[PDB]
Amino acid sequence: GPGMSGRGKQGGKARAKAKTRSSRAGLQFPVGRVHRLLRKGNYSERVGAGAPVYLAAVLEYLTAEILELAGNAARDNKKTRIIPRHLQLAIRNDEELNKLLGRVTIAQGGVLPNIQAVLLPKKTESHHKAKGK
């Protein structure tokens, strides 16, 4: 039969929430944060939009040979993962990795595998038999 009546008193209702945006939520990409990391580093007055992009490309290659040789060391030692011991080997045993890590070493004057001729000092004139009396 008849339904129960609502209270005669006005107000006391919950306020309506503000409508959410129509535009769909994008994914977080890292290069927009790398721009801010360069700014936090304070390398110069302004960071160009291309700078973090070009530096991301540089960064990829800066350990590519480290990863290659450390993964070779892991395969050789029959390991499932790369560990610090593979890096201790890979770094010390390859001079291009000694250049990639920290202080750049001088490229020229590097040791060649073929035995080089010994540069003898300039010999003085040998003392000939002195003229007697």
Partner: protein, 129 residues
């Protein structure tokens, strides 16, 4: 008159898209609820590992060491880019000074990878999202 041939028409020009309403951007700065790991060299640690050695993983220690190893040369690259900007009388570092800064620090094939193929790789970063 109808006895004349119809002239060859161009393909119909596409209708311009309507001006999309720019909505209130939600604050994603200082967020506590994210799935993105702290933005660091770890990005390329896993990428190049899986590309070259799909059979081989890495430890958290070895990842941390590779990040430090890159940072020690990245600091030098930043210093050299700054030095180049000073000699060029600029307050800002250019997108070209960084390439030269890397080349100066990376003799032989290291620049062929990091700078020459690095500049070729920019096309991938601009095409892909």
């Amino acid at each position: 008159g109808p006895g004349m041939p119809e002239p060859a028409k161009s393909a119909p020009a596409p209708k311009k898209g309507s001006k999309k309403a720019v909505t209130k951007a939600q604050k994603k700065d200082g967020k506590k609820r994210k799935r993105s790991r702290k933005e660091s060299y770890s990005i390329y640690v896993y990428k190049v590992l899986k590309q070259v050695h799909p059979d081989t993983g890495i430890s958290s220690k070895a990842m941390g060491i590779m990040n430090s190893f890159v940072n020690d040369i990245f600091e030098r690259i930043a210093g050299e880019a700054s030095r180049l900007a000073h000699y060029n009388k600029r307050s800002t570092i250019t997108s070209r000074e960084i390439q030269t800064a890397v080349r100066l620090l990376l003799p032989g094939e290291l620049a062929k990878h990091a700078v020459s193929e690095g500049t070729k790789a920019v096309t991938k970063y601009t095409s892909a999202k």
